[PDB]
Design a protein around this ligand. Sequence first.
Ligand SMILES: C[C@@H](O)[C@@H](C(=O)O)[C@@H]1NC(C(=O)O)=C(S[C@@H]2CN[C@H](C(=O)N(C)C)C2)[C@@H]1C
Ligand SMILES: [Zn+2]
Ligand SMILES: [Zn+2]
Length: 228
Amino acid sequence: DQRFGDLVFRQLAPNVWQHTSYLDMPGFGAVASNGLIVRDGGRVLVVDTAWTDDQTAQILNWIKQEINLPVALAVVTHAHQDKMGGMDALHAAGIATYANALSNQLAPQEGMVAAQHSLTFAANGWVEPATAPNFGPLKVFYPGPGHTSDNITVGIDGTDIAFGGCLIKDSKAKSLGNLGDADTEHYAASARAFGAAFPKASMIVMSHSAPDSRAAITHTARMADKLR
Ligand SMILES: C[C@@H](O)[C@@H](C(=O)O)[C@@H]1NC(C(=O)O)=C(S[C@@H]2CN[C@H](C(=O)N(C)C)C2)[C@@H]1C
Ligand SMILES: [Zn+2]
Ligand SMILES: [Zn+2]
């Protein structure tokens, strides 16, 4: 693990890093949140911000020191603080930001700064390529409503890695966490759709735990089955 300021970075693959930031909340202690950093040729791609602007700025600075490649774009997975809390740091650095169109619509109600561009999806859940230009190895998939209505997922081509965000919990989880904005009826199917969208991905990266196997997907879905 490499520390830059208040953040921790872990290399998962030759061109993929996991960034981790923490926010201590009154009565709960430190809550960790994970995102991805992906090197694609002569540029860097970012998945999700940190909890805050300051933490997100530390991500960009770390990228400059350890990788020294320009950050071309960033994708955020849904409109919550752990994923979109640091949008300002990205925009301040002049980095193009992308989110689900629904995420951008919900952002002001959620107290988040909207992304500069909106992703739209076909009926099979795959992103409209026109709305996701030059995304490189990033394969964006909308599994359907689960953790939230706008929550999206990202697969990394050329690797065994897929990112489920807050939709997927790890195999040791006892609950699905915050179900405040959740679609309890479609959660299970959405979790399974994510697994089916990236069938070869052996390393599942998620927001609030270390990378797990595919069992995390199935376990999440089966927990979600109990919500129906
Ligand atoms: C503050 C929000 O970003 C919240 C959310 O996205 O709903 C955060 N993301 C989630 C989540 O469930 O995906 C949480 S809950 C956090 C992870 N689940 C833990 C939990 O509920 N435990 C009982 C450990 C704490 C965080 C507080
Ligand atoms: Zn959330
Ligand atoms: Zn979360």
